[PDB]
Structure 1
């Protein structure tokens, strides 16, 4: 819910021009960054070591113990019985990890706050990674082992004879996923390939709630599947499949944002005793370090700054906390017709890859937001070219290209990764210490914010200050197709919500396959024009590209005798938007979706 919000600002503006305080901030975050970096690797190192006998039950204490051992080492003297047990178990491995990596204990004082944030954040990473991807990888494992891609090509489609494999797969999947209890009558008929897959999944020992499906169990207790997820990665490595990061690692050497709260502020920045700070208000204590009078720290929507920020030496994120905090199908236009009628103007958007947004209204005013426009305004490609050139000058590209894979689940393989990373850590650390790397992150945010701000401003001047957006439901969220490039599809819904612009979803079925002029898909033609490939590397290779954004209608009524082409050309994005307006117009009038676009 709307209980927290953030306002990013630059390091110079956020903090007062005090050299001493600023230097302490940079030094403190650097130490915390190192602890987080090695802690994540140390956690994986411990898991890969103890997995030979018994898989550890990773818990918040496990991550906390690793962080404390890296900082204090044997000097850490926890009083809780549970934490003490982890200290003894983990101490031998942390010392061994330090020797391999050469890390020296910072012995930082008053790190309790930093450890808690890192422990909670890192523990959250374990839950989310397993929660949202255990099913994905397991299903992918089944397909790769059976080579479903090979079977599809080898076995002709739409043939009753070959339907047995897909029907066979369902029975196999149910047994593997424990949806159906295995029985002798079926196991005897398993082919050797199927039998091998059965044993491998059984070795994973998937937790399974008898009263709920497997998917529900993952959501209910995702961490219970962590032992299986790590062991699943081993199968990928064994068979050469594309490995996945079972255990998250903070590999990046660039300055990562470190949360700084009131407790950390006085202990490290002001360097004053706890009693001295307790006698001063939290807001007053911050004013001696940060310029709270600036725009970022001002309250919004009843949310006030509560002495919690994250900084990385170039940008500062200011968090506003609501007092009511925890203290540590409906979006479719069909269900929102009354709102659309009262809307001053309705704009239909057809998302695409090159044309991220293609907007049209009843007046026919066309507006688009292209990927090239975003790249130039955002400067991502400009930064990418500069970043690549800078690496070549420093020679770091040759170093990073040969780093052993960190996704390996083998102790020996992971040890090589640490040794290689340690071998050139100094040179790469110096290269990444340059302000440019952090500035690009901050400059990218400014450029991205301005680019979106101009988009809204341009749209408002194009269609009006207040308008309703009916955006197509198409989106490749998290599943970008091969080739092409990443594009913003579902993020525009949030952006419109932020700008108080109503956003509604509309089905795109047959929106790009019906001619609006005649409302018929019988005479619509596609993929009829061909030209040399637009991609320069493909063009030199001699490959040819087929025009996709150009459509045409051969219906005689849409034709004119003067044309030698014989078809009324239509732009794909323009054609889709026009059809959407027809769909919206019919729905508003109460006639529902046109039968031509019906899925029926």
Structure 2
């Protein structure tokens, strides 16, 4: 929530030059990464193995037991009965997975904090994935079975007589989702394909709530839908449809950020006994290894360091925690008109795929922030090319390209995937252990900060010290993140509808004479260009009304830039709203 914030700095600046502490941190994070990866893989293996009888009720205890068995094995001695039962149930499968992958127990001491963090993170990932995408995948399967993609081509489009099927589907889903209780007579009207789909959906054993819809049930207790979600994945694999990651495997070999709190310095880094450490204040203890006088550790908006960082070997994210922590169409300009009138200057912004921002003012001054500029400043393209060159030189591409899909729900296929991953684990681990990846991430962060700061500085220099931002509500290229950026710089941002803003000429206010796609040219994309394809120009528009024309023009139409027209029409709309006349009729929906 609002009670927490983060400041990201370099590894060298955050920590003192004592090499022992840095080496201990680097060693600890590497062990934690492997533990998390193998825990996720073992959880998936156990789920697939138990699929023979029933999908288990996965809780925090399951992942915690998997982690402990990987780290300690039989040496784990839980006190409570539930954890002991989980240990007894998971030990054989964990040992079998270790044999398959050749895992060697690290026997790391003092793993409580890291194990708790990893268990919480993995359960959060499971919950988020299931909650967010169970409905999406179910509806996607429903559409795929009925060939809705091909049904448009099979039937003549835009015909009332053919609307029956697309209406029939709308009803079937309501029966399948338990949204509407079907009448008994309708059950006998199902065609064989519909009956098969109904049986397949029934086999999923989807939970249900009588008082609230299925969507509310998913949010209320998303994890209860996990057993069905996995089943759904299997259905895909039965029909060859594009599969999805049912279980969130943690596969990346690059060093992931690992959390470090006061306890981790307590035990692993400083290696001081708990009794001795309890006699020292937290701030001094952290100062013994960290330069808290650095800029990154300063208080902001009443927040304080409070001993919490995340490190990956190249960058350190220090978390500032407010003292009051838990400790265990509002955005549209229509509703914000009163605030707009007090702005010194008003900026109207149109987003586009290429021109990420196209900004204009009432005084006519224009500005833009394009995709190419963002790519160049951020360095994404250069880093991508260098990474591709490294992969080509090391030959890792041939190894990764042949890896069997990890989304399979069959035990044999998952075992084959694990064997293939083990076969070349050593080479890829060394390749991704290179400092290039974390350094690239840190440099990308710095470049993004620089680019955003330069953008804000240029906007202030062109449009004044303070101004209000009005942006279109279109979204697909950065689309919705900008709303946050202006907030970080204390610049107001408001939304505006783009309906037909690109089909009206501001100088005659008549949409009947607007020309679209009046010229064609060889395709801009080189691979499409060599293919012989031709592209219609989208951003160029024409006006044919005589009032906008002149006798000295042989073209016969006044030319306009699409972004310029959009910004001018949006400025006119804003002026009309501020004048009390509301949205102009021409741009109004109906």
Tell me the TM-score normalized by structure 1: 0.97
Quote how far apart the aligned CAs of 1:382 are: 0.5
Quote how far apart the aligned CAs of 1:153 are: 1.5
The equivalent of 1:74 in structure 2 is: 74
Quote how far apart the aligned CAs of 1:574 are: 1.0
What per-residue deviation string (whole Å, max 9, x for no partner) do you get for residues 505-557 of structure 1? 00111111111111121111111111101101111111111111111111111
Q: Find 1:507's aligned residue among 490, 497, 519.
A: 497
The 5 A counterparts of 1:210-229 are 210-229=210-229
Aligned to 1:508, the other structure's residue is in SS state: coil
Aligned partners of 1:125 and 1:358: how far apart in 2?
37
Aligned to 1:457, the other structure's residue is in SS state: helix
Extract unaligned runs of 5+ from structure 1: 477-486
Quote how far apart the aligned CAs of 1:64 are: 0.8
Quote how far apart the aligned CAs of 1:498 are: 0.7
What per-residue deviation string (whole Å, max 9, x for no partner) do you get for residues 219-260 of structure 1? 111111111111111111111111110100111000000000
What per-residue deviation string (whole Å, max 9, x for no partner) do you get for residues 569-596 of structure 1? 1111111011000000000000000000
Which deviates the most, 426-435 or 516-525? Answer: 516-525
Aligned partners of 1:68 and 1:359: how far apart in 2?
55
What per-residue deviation string (whole Å, max 9, x for no partner) do you get for residues 272-310 of structure 1? 111111111111111111111101111100010111100
What per-residue deviation string (whole Å, max 9, x for no partner) do you get for residues 22-63 of structure 1? 000000000000001111111111111101101101111111
Aligned to 1:166, the other structure's residue is in SS state: helix
Quote how far apart the aligned CAs of 1:158 are: 2.8
The equivalent of 2:440 in structure 1 is: 440
Aligned partners of 1:170 and 1:325: how far apart in 2?
46
The 5 A counterparts of 1:471-486 are 471-476=471-476
The equivalent of 1:578 in structure 2 is: 568
Quote how far apart the aligned CAs of 1:141 are: 0.9
Which deviates the most, 119-128 or 181-190? Answer: 181-190
* Deviation beyond 2 Å, 4+ runs, structure 1: none
Aligned partners of 2:575 and 2:435: how far apart in 1?
54
The equivalent of 2:361 in structure 1 is: 361
Aligned partners of 1:345 and 1:408: how far apart in 2?
56
Which deviates the most, 182-191 or 533-542? Answer: 182-191
Quote how far apart the aligned CAs of 1:157 are: 2.6
Aligned partners of 1:306 and 1:230: how far apart in 2?
41
Quote how far apart the aligned CAs of 1:183 are: 3.8
Aligned to 2:173, the other structure's residue is in SS state: helix
Aligned partners of 1:355 and 1:237: how far apart in 2?
40
The equivalent of 1:420 in structure 2 is: 420
Aligned partners of 1:30 and 1:409: how far apart in 2?
29
What per-residue deviation string (whole Å, max 9, x for no partner) do you get for residues 434-473 of structure 1? 1001111111101111111111111111111111000000
Which deviates the most, 310-319 or 156-165? Answer: 156-165
The 5 A counterparts of 1:69-468 are 69-468=69-468
Aligned to 1:471, the other structure's residue is in SS state: strand
Aligned partners of 1:552 and 1:84: how far apart in 2?
75
Quote how far apart the aligned CAs of 1:160 are: 2.0
Extract unaligned runs of 5+ from structure 2: none
The equivalent of 1:480 in structure 2 is: none
Aligned to 2:348, the other structure's residue is in SS state: strand
The equivalent of 1:587 in structure 2 is: 577
Quote how far apart the aligned CAs of 1:146 are: 0.7
Quote how far apart the aligned CAs of 1:184 are: 3.0
Quote how far apart the aligned CAs of 1:337 are: 0.3
Aligned to 2:341, the other structure's residue is in SS state: helix
Aligned partners of 2:225 and 2:507: how far apart in 1?
55
Aligned partners of 2:117 and 2:510: how far apart in 1?
59
Which deviates the most, 389-398 or 163-172? Answer: 163-172
- Alignment length (residue pairs): 590
Aligned to 1:368, the other structure's residue is in SS state: strand
Which deviates the most, 422-431 or 166-175? Answer: 166-175
Aligned to 2:308, the other structure's residue is in SS state: strand
Aligned partners of 1:381 and 1:330: how far apart in 2?
37
Quote how far apart the aligned CAs of 1:328 are: 3.4
Tell me the TM-score normalized by structure 2: 0.99
Which deviates the most, 153-162 or 291-300? Answer: 153-162
Aligned partners of 2:548 and 2:153: how far apart in 1?
40
Aligned to 1:318, the other structure's residue is in SS state: strand
Q: Find 2:536's aligned residue among 505, 529, 546.
A: 546
Aligned partners of 1:228 and 1:82: how far apart in 2?
24
Aligned to 1:304, the other structure's residue is in SS state: coil
The 5 A counterparts of 1:522-533 are 522-533=512-523
Which deviates the most, 229-238 or 584-593? Answer: 229-238
What per-residue deviation string (whole Å, max 9, x for no partner) do you get for residues 179-231 of structure 1? 12234311211111111111111111111111001111111111111111111
Quote how far apart the aligned CAs of 1:428 are: 0.5
Quote how far apart the aligned CAs of 1:166 are: 1.6
Aligned to 2:211, the other structure's residue is in SS state: coil
**Alignment RMSD (CA, Å):** 0.8
Aligned partners of 1:178 and 1:77: how far apart in 2?
46
Aligned partners of 2:9 and 2:418: how far apart in 1?
35
Aligned partners of 1:520 and 1:426: how far apart in 2?
67
Aligned to 1:306, the other structure's residue is in SS state: coil
Aligned partners of 1:74 and 1:565: how far apart in 2?
84
Aligned to 1:336, the other structure's residue is in SS state: helix
Which deviates the most, 511-520 or 571-580? Answer: 511-520
What per-residue deviation string (whole Å, max 9, x for no partner) do you get for residues 135-175 of structure 1? 11111111111111111121123322111112211220111
Aligned partners of 2:410 and 2:443: how far apart in 1?
39
